Design a protein around this ligand. Structure first.
Ligand SMILES: NC(=O)C1=CN([C@@H]2O[C@H](COP(=O)(O)OP(=O)(O)OC[C@H]3O[C@@H](n4cnc5c(N)ncnc54)[C@H](OP(=O)(O)O)[C@@H]3O)[C@@H](O)[C@H]2O)C=CC1
Length: 322
Protein backbone atom coordinates (compact mmCIF):
# COMPACT_ATOMS: atom_id res chain seq x y z
CA UNK A 1 0.00 0.00 0.00
CA UNK A 2 1.47 3.38 -1.03
CA UNK A 3 0.49 4.84 2.36
CA UNK A 4 3.26 2.82 4.04
CA UNK A 5 5.98 4.19 1.80
CA UNK A 6 9.28 5.22 3.32
CA UNK A 7 12.31 7.36 2.35
CA UNK A 8 15.94 6.15 3.02
CA UNK A 9 17.91 7.91 5.73
CA UNK A 10 21.66 8.24 5.42
CA UNK A 11 22.26 5.76 8.20
CA UNK A 12 20.47 2.90 6.58
CA UNK A 13 17.14 3.30 8.38
CA UNK A 14 13.87 4.31 6.65
CA UNK A 15 11.30 6.93 7.60
CA UNK A 16 7.60 6.93 6.56
CA UNK A 17 6.99 9.91 4.25
CA UNK A 18 3.82 11.02 6.04
CA UNK A 19 3.94 11.58 9.80
CA UNK A 20 1.39 12.20 12.44
CA UNK A 21 1.93 15.36 14.50
CA UNK A 22 1.02 15.28 18.22
CA UNK A 23 1.48 18.89 19.46
CA UNK A 24 -1.63 20.78 20.56
CA UNK A 25 -2.21 24.03 22.40
CA UNK A 26 -1.75 23.91 26.16
CA UNK A 27 -5.50 24.06 26.89
CA UNK A 28 -5.99 20.74 25.09
CA UNK A 29 -5.59 17.81 27.46
CA UNK A 30 -2.85 15.38 26.70
CA UNK A 31 -5.45 12.57 26.53
CA UNK A 32 -6.57 13.86 23.20
CA UNK A 33 -3.14 12.99 21.80
CA UNK A 34 -3.54 9.53 23.06
CA UNK A 35 -6.96 9.08 21.51
CA UNK A 36 -5.92 10.63 18.21
CA UNK A 37 -2.73 8.62 17.90
CA UNK A 38 -4.77 5.43 18.25
CA UNK A 39 -7.10 6.58 15.46
CA UNK A 40 -4.08 7.58 13.34
CA UNK A 41 -2.55 4.19 13.68
CA UNK A 42 -5.82 2.55 12.77
CA UNK A 43 -5.99 4.80 9.67
CA UNK A 44 -2.49 3.75 8.56
CA UNK A 45 -0.11 6.30 10.08
CA UNK A 46 3.13 4.70 11.28
CA UNK A 47 5.41 7.78 11.75
CA UNK A 48 4.49 9.64 14.95
CA UNK A 49 6.18 12.97 15.87
CA UNK A 50 6.42 14.16 19.49
CA UNK A 51 8.90 15.94 21.75
CA UNK A 52 9.83 16.34 25.40
CA UNK A 53 8.42 19.86 25.14
CA UNK A 54 4.90 18.53 24.25
CA UNK A 55 4.48 16.86 27.65
CA UNK A 56 2.54 14.06 25.96
CA UNK A 57 4.98 11.12 25.82
CA UNK A 58 3.23 9.03 28.48
CA UNK A 59 -0.01 9.46 26.53
CA UNK A 60 1.47 8.88 23.04
CA UNK A 61 3.40 5.89 24.45
CA UNK A 62 0.17 4.46 25.80
CA UNK A 63 -1.46 4.86 22.43
CA UNK A 64 1.41 3.11 20.65
CA UNK A 65 1.63 0.28 23.25
CA UNK A 66 -2.24 -0.19 23.06
CA UNK A 67 -1.95 -0.64 19.28
CA UNK A 68 0.89 -3.13 19.78
CA UNK A 69 -1.11 -5.01 22.35
CA UNK A 70 -4.38 -5.17 20.25
CA UNK A 71 -2.11 -6.36 17.33
CA UNK A 72 -2.72 -3.56 14.90
CA UNK A 73 1.05 -3.01 14.73
CA UNK A 74 4.34 -4.35 15.95
CA UNK A 75 6.95 -2.01 17.45
CA UNK A 76 9.01 -2.25 14.33
CA UNK A 77 6.09 -0.98 12.20
CA UNK A 78 6.00 2.33 14.21
CA UNK A 79 8.50 5.11 13.58
CA UNK A 80 8.46 7.37 16.70
CA UNK A 81 10.36 10.68 16.93
CA UNK A 82 11.21 12.65 20.06
CA UNK A 83 13.19 15.87 20.52
CA UNK A 84 15.83 17.15 22.96
CA UNK A 85 14.63 20.37 24.51
CA UNK A 86 16.81 23.44 24.82
CA UNK A 87 17.38 23.20 28.58
CA UNK A 88 19.06 19.81 28.05
CA UNK A 89 21.70 20.73 25.54
CA UNK A 90 24.57 20.31 27.99
CA UNK A 91 26.28 16.97 27.06
CA UNK A 92 25.73 15.40 30.47
CA UNK A 93 22.02 16.09 30.27
CA UNK A 94 21.30 14.61 26.79
CA UNK A 95 21.22 10.84 27.47
CA UNK A 96 19.39 11.27 30.77
CA UNK A 97 16.73 13.25 28.95
CA UNK A 98 16.28 10.62 26.32
CA UNK A 99 16.15 7.96 29.02
CA UNK A 100 13.39 9.95 30.75
CA UNK A 101 11.41 10.12 27.57
CA UNK A 102 11.86 6.35 27.14
CA UNK A 103 10.69 5.69 30.70
CA UNK A 104 7.55 7.89 30.09
CA UNK A 105 6.87 6.10 26.75
CA UNK A 106 7.67 2.63 28.23
CA UNK A 107 9.56 1.93 25.07
CA UNK A 108 13.17 0.66 24.69
CA UNK A 109 14.23 3.07 21.91
CA UNK A 110 12.99 5.96 19.77
CA UNK A 111 13.34 5.70 16.00
CA UNK A 112 14.53 9.25 15.80
CA UNK A 113 15.87 11.72 18.32
CA UNK A 114 16.46 15.26 17.18
CA UNK A 115 17.80 18.54 18.65
CA UNK A 116 14.56 20.60 18.87
CA UNK A 117 16.24 23.98 18.37
CA UNK A 118 19.80 25.17 18.11
CA UNK A 119 19.53 27.61 21.08
CA UNK A 120 20.51 26.21 24.47
CA UNK A 121 18.63 27.64 27.53
CA UNK A 122 19.50 27.65 31.15
CA UNK A 123 19.01 24.29 32.75
CA UNK A 124 16.72 23.86 35.54
CA UNK A 125 13.22 23.20 36.50
CA UNK A 126 11.55 25.60 34.06
CA UNK A 127 11.02 24.54 30.46
CA UNK A 128 11.57 28.19 29.38
CA UNK A 129 13.33 29.85 32.29
CA UNK A 130 12.83 33.61 32.31
CA UNK A 131 14.00 36.74 34.05
CA UNK A 132 11.84 39.33 35.86
CA UNK A 133 10.72 40.84 32.56
CA UNK A 134 9.51 37.52 31.12
CA UNK A 135 12.47 37.04 28.77
CA UNK A 136 14.17 33.65 28.34
CA UNK A 137 17.52 32.87 29.92
CA UNK A 138 20.16 31.67 27.59
CA UNK A 139 22.97 29.17 28.00
CA UNK A 140 26.29 28.78 26.24
CA UNK A 141 26.80 25.25 24.93
CA UNK A 142 28.64 24.17 21.84
CA UNK A 143 26.15 22.58 19.44
CA UNK A 144 28.90 20.13 18.42
CA UNK A 145 29.25 19.01 22.03
CA UNK A 146 25.48 18.40 22.12
CA UNK A 147 25.82 16.48 18.90
CA UNK A 148 28.48 14.16 20.16
CA UNK A 149 26.21 13.29 23.11
CA UNK A 150 23.44 12.51 20.55
CA UNK A 151 25.87 10.18 18.73
CA UNK A 152 26.48 8.34 21.98
CA UNK A 153 22.69 7.81 22.24
CA UNK A 154 22.68 6.14 18.83
CA UNK A 155 25.62 4.01 19.81
CA UNK A 156 23.74 2.95 23.02
CA UNK A 157 20.80 1.80 20.93
CA UNK A 158 18.42 4.33 22.57
CA UNK A 159 17.82 6.24 19.26
CA UNK A 160 17.89 4.28 15.99
CA UNK A 161 18.63 7.56 14.13
CA UNK A 162 19.57 11.14 15.18
CA UNK A 163 18.91 14.47 13.53
CA UNK A 164 18.12 18.16 14.05
CA UNK A 165 15.24 20.65 13.89
CA UNK A 166 15.16 24.39 13.14
CA UNK A 167 18.77 24.47 11.97
CA UNK A 168 19.98 26.76 9.22
CA UNK A 169 22.53 25.99 6.56
CA UNK A 170 25.46 27.46 8.65
CA UNK A 171 24.41 25.34 11.61
CA UNK A 172 24.12 22.16 9.59
CA UNK A 173 27.65 22.83 8.19
CA UNK A 174 28.95 23.12 11.76
CA UNK A 175 27.94 19.54 12.44
CA UNK A 176 28.82 18.25 9.00
CA UNK A 177 32.28 19.73 9.34
CA UNK A 178 32.84 18.60 13.04
CA UNK A 179 36.19 16.93 13.46
CA UNK A 180 35.60 13.34 14.44
CA UNK A 181 32.03 13.42 13.24
CA UNK A 182 30.61 9.91 13.45
CA UNK A 183 26.98 10.28 12.41
CA UNK A 184 25.56 12.93 10.08
CA UNK A 185 22.09 14.37 11.09
CA UNK A 186 19.65 12.28 9.08
CA UNK A 187 17.09 15.12 8.90
CA UNK A 188 16.35 18.65 9.48
CA UNK A 189 12.80 19.21 10.69
CA UNK A 190 11.73 22.75 9.74
CA UNK A 191 8.65 24.82 9.08
CA UNK A 192 7.56 24.30 5.47
CA UNK A 193 4.40 25.08 3.53
CA UNK A 194 3.50 27.13 0.43
CA UNK A 195 4.14 30.44 2.25
CA UNK A 196 7.61 29.29 3.35
CA UNK A 197 8.57 26.66 0.79
CA UNK A 198 12.18 26.29 1.90
CA UNK A 199 13.45 25.85 -1.64
CA UNK A 200 17.05 26.93 -0.84
CA UNK A 201 17.35 24.89 2.38
CA UNK A 202 15.75 21.89 0.64
CA UNK A 203 18.31 22.01 -2.16
CA UNK A 204 21.13 22.28 0.41
CA UNK A 205 19.78 19.34 2.44
CA UNK A 206 19.34 17.22 -0.64
CA UNK A 207 23.03 18.03 -1.73
CA UNK A 208 24.14 16.63 1.61
CA UNK A 209 21.80 13.63 1.87
CA UNK A 210 19.79 15.12 4.73
CA UNK A 211 15.97 14.58 4.60
CA UNK A 212 13.89 17.76 5.11
CA UNK A 213 10.91 17.13 7.40
CA UNK A 214 8.09 19.71 7.19
CA UNK A 215 6.16 20.97 10.14
CA UNK A 216 3.21 23.36 10.17
CA UNK A 217 2.51 22.05 6.71
CA UNK A 218 -1.20 22.77 7.19
CA UNK A 219 -0.57 26.32 8.46
CA UNK A 220 -0.18 25.68 12.24
CA UNK A 221 -2.58 26.19 15.11
CA UNK A 222 -2.12 29.97 14.74
CA UNK A 223 -2.01 30.37 18.44
CA UNK A 224 -1.93 34.00 19.50
CA UNK A 225 1.27 34.33 21.52
CA UNK A 226 3.04 32.87 18.56
CA UNK A 227 1.16 34.12 15.47
CA UNK A 228 -0.15 37.65 14.73
CA UNK A 229 -3.70 37.41 13.50
CA UNK A 230 -2.50 39.20 10.36
CA UNK A 231 -0.79 35.91 9.50
CA UNK A 232 -1.86 34.55 6.06
CA UNK A 233 -4.31 31.56 6.57
CA UNK A 234 -2.97 28.73 4.59
CA UNK A 235 -6.08 26.40 4.52
CA UNK A 236 -8.24 29.39 3.30
CA UNK A 237 -5.81 30.29 0.55
CA UNK A 238 -7.99 30.83 -2.53
CA UNK A 239 -5.43 29.35 -5.02
CA UNK A 240 -4.93 26.19 -2.86
CA UNK A 241 -8.72 26.12 -2.84
CA UNK A 242 -8.93 26.29 -6.60
CA UNK A 243 -6.53 23.48 -6.92
CA UNK A 244 -8.46 21.44 -4.41
CA UNK A 245 -11.59 21.90 -6.53
CA UNK A 246 -9.62 21.04 -9.77
CA UNK A 247 -8.45 17.76 -8.25
CA UNK A 248 -11.59 16.98 -6.15
CA UNK A 249 -9.46 16.97 -2.99
CA UNK A 250 -9.32 19.42 -0.02
CA UNK A 251 -6.93 22.31 0.72
CA UNK A 252 -5.15 20.24 3.32
CA UNK A 253 -4.59 17.47 0.84
CA UNK A 254 -3.10 19.85 -1.74
CA UNK A 255 -0.76 21.26 0.87
CA UNK A 256 0.41 17.79 1.91
CA UNK A 257 0.77 16.48 -1.65
CA UNK A 258 2.88 19.52 -2.65
CA UNK A 259 5.40 18.47 -0.03
CA UNK A 260 5.45 14.76 -0.87
CA UNK A 261 6.22 15.52 -4.53
CA UNK A 262 9.18 17.65 -3.56
CA UNK A 263 10.90 14.72 -1.68
CA UNK A 264 9.90 16.18 1.70
CA UNK A 265 8.72 14.07 4.60
CA UNK A 266 5.59 15.88 5.78
CA UNK A 267 3.90 15.99 9.16
CA UNK A 268 0.21 16.57 9.63
CA UNK A 269 -1.51 17.01 13.04
CA UNK A 270 -5.21 16.41 13.49
CA UNK A 271 -7.11 15.33 16.59
CA UNK A 272 -10.34 14.96 14.51
CA UNK A 273 -11.08 11.45 13.33
CA UNK A 274 -12.51 12.46 9.90
CA UNK A 275 -9.46 14.64 9.19
CA UNK A 276 -6.96 12.04 10.25
CA UNK A 277 -8.55 9.67 7.74
CA UNK A 278 -8.61 12.42 5.09
CA UNK A 279 -5.00 13.34 5.51
CA UNK A 280 -3.73 9.87 4.65
CA UNK A 281 -5.64 10.07 1.42
CA UNK A 282 -2.69 12.16 0.19
CA UNK A 283 -1.41 8.97 -1.37
CA UNK A 284 -4.50 8.65 -3.60
CA UNK A 285 -3.87 11.42 -6.11
CA UNK A 286 -1.09 13.30 -7.83
CA UNK A 287 -0.41 16.91 -8.93
CA UNK A 288 0.98 17.82 -12.32
CA UNK A 289 4.13 19.82 -12.62
CA UNK A 290 2.33 22.88 -13.81
CA UNK A 291 0.32 22.93 -10.60
CA UNK A 292 3.41 22.45 -8.48
CA UNK A 293 4.86 25.58 -10.19
CA UNK A 294 1.79 27.52 -9.39
CA UNK A 295 1.92 26.53 -5.74
CA UNK A 296 5.62 27.69 -5.73
CA UNK A 297 4.23 31.24 -6.53
CA UNK A 298 2.71 31.44 -3.04
CA UNK A 299 6.14 31.70 -1.33
CA UNK A 300 6.40 34.73 0.85
CA UNK A 301 8.85 33.91 3.48
CA UNK A 302 6.22 33.82 6.20
CA UNK A 303 6.95 31.97 9.40
CA UNK A 304 4.22 30.82 11.81
CA UNK A 305 7.10 29.78 14.15
CA UNK A 306 9.56 32.66 14.76
CA UNK A 307 10.82 31.30 18.13
CA UNK A 308 10.78 34.78 19.67
CA UNK A 309 11.97 33.28 22.98
CA UNK A 310 15.39 32.92 21.28
CA UNK A 311 15.67 36.37 19.82
CA UNK A 312 19.06 37.65 21.07
CA UNK A 313 20.62 34.19 21.32
CA UNK A 314 23.83 33.72 19.26
CA UNK A 315 22.40 30.64 17.68
CA UNK A 316 19.04 32.13 16.72
CA UNK A 317 18.38 30.33 13.43
CA UNK A 318 16.08 32.50 11.39
CA UNK A 319 18.14 35.66 10.74
CA UNK A 320 20.15 33.98 7.87
CA UNK A 321 18.55 33.89 4.49
CA UNK A 322 18.49 30.10 4.88
N1 LIG B 1 10.19 20.92 15.28
C1 LIG B 1 9.49 21.93 15.66
O1 LIG B 1 9.90 22.95 16.18
C2 LIG B 1 7.98 21.89 15.47
C3 LIG B 1 7.38 20.66 15.18
N2 LIG B 1 6.04 20.53 14.94
C4 LIG B 1 5.45 19.18 14.66
O2 LIG B 1 4.68 19.30 13.47
C5 LIG B 1 3.30 18.93 13.80
C6 LIG B 1 2.41 19.64 12.81
O3 LIG B 1 2.46 21.03 12.89
P1 LIG B 1 1.36 21.88 13.64
O4 LIG B 1 1.83 23.17 13.58
O5 LIG B 1 1.01 21.22 14.93
O6 LIG B 1 0.06 21.85 12.77
P2 LIG B 1 -0.41 21.60 11.27
O7 LIG B 1 0.16 22.60 10.38
O8 LIG B 1 -0.23 20.24 11.00
O9 LIG B 1 -1.93 22.01 11.43
C7 LIG B 1 -2.77 21.53 12.49
C8 LIG B 1 -4.11 22.24 12.36
O10 LIG B 1 -4.73 21.88 11.10
C9 LIG B 1 -6.00 21.28 11.47
N3 LIG B 1 -6.21 20.29 10.43
C10 LIG B 1 -5.57 19.05 10.36
N4 LIG B 1 -5.94 18.35 9.27
C11 LIG B 1 -6.92 19.13 8.67
C12 LIG B 1 -7.72 18.84 7.51
N5 LIG B 1 -7.61 17.78 6.78
N6 LIG B 1 -8.60 19.85 7.22
C13 LIG B 1 -8.71 20.91 7.95
N7 LIG B 1 -7.94 21.21 9.06
C14 LIG B 1 -7.06 20.26 9.39
C15 LIG B 1 -5.87 20.81 12.89
O11 LIG B 1 -7.16 20.76 13.48
P3 LIG B 1 -7.68 19.55 14.40
O12 LIG B 1 -6.50 18.92 15.08
O13 LIG B 1 -8.61 20.28 15.35
O14 LIG B 1 -8.42 18.60 13.47
C16 LIG B 1 -4.99 21.87 13.55
O15 LIG B 1 -5.77 23.03 13.87
C17 LIG B 1 3.15 19.21 15.22
O16 LIG B 1 2.02 18.58 15.81
C18 LIG B 1 4.48 18.69 15.72
O17 LIG B 1 4.43 17.27 15.78
C19 LIG B 1 5.31 21.77 14.79
C20 LIG B 1 5.86 22.94 15.09
C21 LIG B 1 7.20 23.04 15.49
Amino acid sequence: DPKFQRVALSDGHFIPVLGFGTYAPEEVPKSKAMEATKIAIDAGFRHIDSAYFYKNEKEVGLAIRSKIADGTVKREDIFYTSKLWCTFHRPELVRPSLEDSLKNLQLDYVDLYIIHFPTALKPGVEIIPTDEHGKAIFDTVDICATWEAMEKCKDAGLAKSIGVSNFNRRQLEMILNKPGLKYKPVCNQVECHPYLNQGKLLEFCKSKGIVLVAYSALGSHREPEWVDQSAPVLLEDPLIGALAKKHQQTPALIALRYQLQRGIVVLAKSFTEKRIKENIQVFEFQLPSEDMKVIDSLNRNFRYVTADFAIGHPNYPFSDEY
